[PDB]
Every structure is written in C-alpha cells, then in structure tokens.
From Swiss-Prot:
UniProt binding sites for Zn(2+) 1: 50, 52, 110, 112
Name of the protein described by the UniProt record: Protease 2A
Organism: Coxsackievirus A16 (strain G-10)
Subunit details: Homodimer.
Signal peptide: none
Upper lineage: Viruses, Riboviria, Orthornavirae, Pisuviricota, Pisoniviricetes
Record's function text: Cysteine protease that cleaves viral polyprotein and specific host proteins. It is responsible for the autocatalytic cleavage between the P1 and P2 regions, which is the first cleavage occurring in the polyprotein. Also cleaves the host translation initiation factor EIF4G1, in order to shut down the capped cellular mRNA translation. Inhibits the host nucleus-cytoplasm protein and RNA trafficking by cleaving host members of the nuclear pores. Counteracts stress granule formation probably by antagonizing its assembly or promoting its dissassembly.
Origin: domain of life: Viruses
Included range, full protein: 869 to 1007 of 2193
C-alpha cells in the first residue's frame, strides 16, 4: 500500500484504489496501473521533473529504504494477476531489488522529489510506475 499526495490529488496503484478513489476519480489508466482521485485536504509532495535513473525507494516487506539504479520508462510485459490479464504495462521502470505484492505503493524518490511508486516485482527485480510526465499534477 501507499499513495502520493500533491495539491488536491491522491495518486495510487489503480489495482489498489478504494470506492472513495473511484467516486472522486480524476484520471485512470489500466495500461500504467495508475489512478488519481481528488482530496479535500492539501498535499505537499513535490513531483520530480527530470530524467534521473538513480534514487531511493521504500520497501514495506523489509521496513527499509534502498538505493537503486532504474531503467527509463518503457513498455514491459507483466504476468497475469487477479487484477489484470498478461499485458504490456507502459511508463514502467525496473531496478534490481527486493519487492513483494504488498510493496506496491511505496514511493521512489530522487534528489528532485517523487519519481513514482512500486507497481510490479519478483525474481529480484522491482518495477515502478513513473509519474514525472504527469505535468498537470502541479496545478
Ligand atoms: N502492475 C501489475 O500488473 C501488478 C499487479 C499486482 C501483482 N503484480 C506483481 O508484480 N506482483 C508481485 C509479485 C512479486 C513481487 C512483487 C510484486 F509486485 C503485478
Ligand atoms: Zn531527479
């Protein structure tokens, strides 16, 4: 679990979104595993606007933050789950690191702010849904 709170927006993994998220829906994209909902309270997270490929992510299954080198956002095949059939997920970045399903939602941050959130993993890899191209999150 985990979310990004920026301005009047809440960013979560689409496969983990609540009834409240869907009733206050702003935008959702199955191919990216992202959903953004509106909030009443104001968010203070800073979204990074950069091409960084190094950062730090939070891994809930280990109660630790890990430094990672990650790939540029791209289409990556993702195995079928209870939430999606097998498909290409777009805007995904991989890194070598520990992840378990419950780790989705953990933030990845670089020096410039929030990069994205854990969305996939397994086999010693961790995949992150990029949020840096979503320029409208800021205003
Ligand atoms: N974005 C997706 O399609 C994910 C939906 C939930 C399930 N997905 C997934 O990768 N599970 C998983 C398994 C082992 C280690 C880490 C993991 F995140 C895929
Ligand atoms: Zn950066």
């Amino acid at each position: 679990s985990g979310a990004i709170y920026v301005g009047n927006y809440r960013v979560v993994n689409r496969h983990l979104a609540t009834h409240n998220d869907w009733a206050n829906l702003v935008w959702e994209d199955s191919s990216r595993d992202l959903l953004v909902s509106s909030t009443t309270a104001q968010g203070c997270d800073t979204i990074a606007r950069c091409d960084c490929q190094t950062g730090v992510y939070y891994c809930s299954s280990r109660r630790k933050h890990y430094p990672v080198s990650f790939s540029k956002p791209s289409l990556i095949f993702v195995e079928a789950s209870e939430y999606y059939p097998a498909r290409y997920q777009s805007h995904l970045m991989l890194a070598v690191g520990h992840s378990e399903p419950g780790d989705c939602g953990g933030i990845l941050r670089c020096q410039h702010g929030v990069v994205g959130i854990v969305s996939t993993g397994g086999n010693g890899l961790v995949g992150f849904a990029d949020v840096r191209d979503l320029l409208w999150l800021d205003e």
